[PDB]
């Protein structure tokens, strides 16, 4: 249902092909939800470098998930501007993958300390886009949804549905009952399990 | 001065479609999003309908559901708003509304007046 | 789906008298809630948005707030303006549901 929607403008995938995304068995999956503006949505990948990827979120070289991100202009976008979807713009380092950083500390970029004052060479950290429906492509908003495959030792909860056929009796058929693989001739008996 | 401008409702038997107008004037129809609020006589305010401002993203409300549907023209800055399987409990009063959002962040800032539209043997 | 209790379904007050109005929420809404003025025969007139501000020109004696389940209007200058039905609106989901109302008698 996700692949053949054609609402979504990028579905770039790293680890995993498409097609077999549903024969895949994983511990777990993690959606990782952001609005971005349209330059920035190349960011949004395995080593690469922006302030979005380097001050917002990072993703990990070794990244086993796929990346879905659709405009949405319509969705949100104010006549004044939204004014309400922020960016980390100052950092004193970089981000560690998969980390979130939630501060609101004033940006020391000056000799003299700042006791959590804005004033010269001190500055909010966090600043708003400026979203407008006048605005033209590639300053417009971008919904991105990260899916981020998990792989460890505990059995596997996530399995891709697994289909099934109508059921034919008495003739020689094969058959796949819930992993009995075999062949024979299926037949109702008056047997009494538990 | 802004102003709205609503018409197009009426008495109109069971099993029939209705089709409402809802000019605009005043400011600029193709960059806000419209919502439609009905009130039934002694009741409070329902919402019906949201439309965005480019016109390619709607939701209808929880009751009406599939058998309303909501449309726009910016060029004729009017709000077209179809009826079908109308039934008899739709007997009220519709607003058309202004929103900044489609999601009415901060929106509902201007109304117009309102057409009644009674549906009844 | 989000549905809009305002426990006093009505409030007895004379010009110039202070009320509290409350909404509740079943779900936890972040701040996405809205005030209304409608006075009967009239269009309903926004007076409080994002459950804390100021509509540009209505007077500065509409003093909202509440976050999370529980939002509460306060006024300290009723005016003969103020006896109407008051609704509230969530915006978290896309199905918007209004409040009951509360009427403003006049003793």
């Known amino acids: 249902v996700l692949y053949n929607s054609a609402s979504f403008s990028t579905f770039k995938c790293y680890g995993v092909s498409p097609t077999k995304l549903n024969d895949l068995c994983f511990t777990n999956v993690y959606a990782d939800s952001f609005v971005i503006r349209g330059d920035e949505v190349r960011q949004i990948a395995p080593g690469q470098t922006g302030k979005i990827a380097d001050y917002n979120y990072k993703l990990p070289d070794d990244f086993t998930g796929c990346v879905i991100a659709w405009n949405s202009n319509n969705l949100d976008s104010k006549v004044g501007g939204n004014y309400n979807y922020r960016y980390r713009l100052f950092r004193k380092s970089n981000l560690k993958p998969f980390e979130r950083d939630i501060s609101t500390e004033i940006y020391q970029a000056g000799s003299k300390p700042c006791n959590g004052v804005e004033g010269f060479n001190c500055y909010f950290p966090l600043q708003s886009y400026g979203f407008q429906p006048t605005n033209g492509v590639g300053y417009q908003p971008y919904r991105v949804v990260v899916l981020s495959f998990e792989l460890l030792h505990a059995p596997a909860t996530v399995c891709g549905p697994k289909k099934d056929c109508n059921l034919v009796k008495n003739k020689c058929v094969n058959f796949n009952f819930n992993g009995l693989t075999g062949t024979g001739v299926l037949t109702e008996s008056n047997k009494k399990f538990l | 001065e802004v102003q709205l401008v609503e018409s197009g409702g009426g008495v109109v038997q069971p099993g029939r479609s209705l089709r409402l107008s809802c000019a605009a004037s005043?400011?600029?129809?193709?960059?806000?999003?419209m919502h439609w609020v009905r009130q039934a006589p002694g009741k409070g305010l329902e919402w019906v309908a949201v439309?965005?401002?480019?016109?390619?993203?709607?939701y209808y409300a929880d009751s009406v559901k599939g058998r309303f549907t909501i449309s726009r023209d910016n060029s004729k800055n009017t709000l077209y708003l179809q009826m079908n399987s109308l039934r008899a409990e739709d007997t009220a009063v519709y607003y058309c509304?202004?929103?900044?959002?489609?999601?009415?962040?901060?929106?509902?800032?201007?109304w117009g007046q309102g057409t009644t539209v009674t549906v009844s043997s | 789906d989000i549905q809009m209790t305002q426990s006093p379904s009505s409030v007895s007050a004379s010009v110039g008298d202070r009320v509290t109005i409350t909404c509740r929420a079943s779900?936890?809404?972040?701040?996405?809630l809205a005030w209304y003025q409608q006075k009967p025969g009239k269009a309903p007139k926004l007076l409080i948005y994002?459950?804390?501000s100021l509509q540009s020109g209505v007077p500065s004696r509409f003093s909202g707030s509440g976050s999370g389940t529980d939002f509460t209007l306060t006024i300290s200058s009723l005016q003969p303006e103020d006896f109407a039905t008051y609704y509230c609106?969530?915006?978290?989901?896309?199905?918007?549901?209004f409040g009951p109302g509360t009427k403003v008698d006049i003793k």
């Open positions: 005043g400011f600029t129809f193709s960059s806000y999003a």
């Open positions: 609106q969530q915006a978290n989901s896309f199905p918007f549901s």
């Open positions: 779900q936890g809404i972040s701040s996405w």
């Open positions: 439309i965005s401002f480019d016109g390619s993203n709607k």
């Open positions: 509304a202004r929103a900044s959002i489609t999601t009415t962040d901060d929106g509902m800032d201007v």
């Open positions: 994002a459950a804390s």
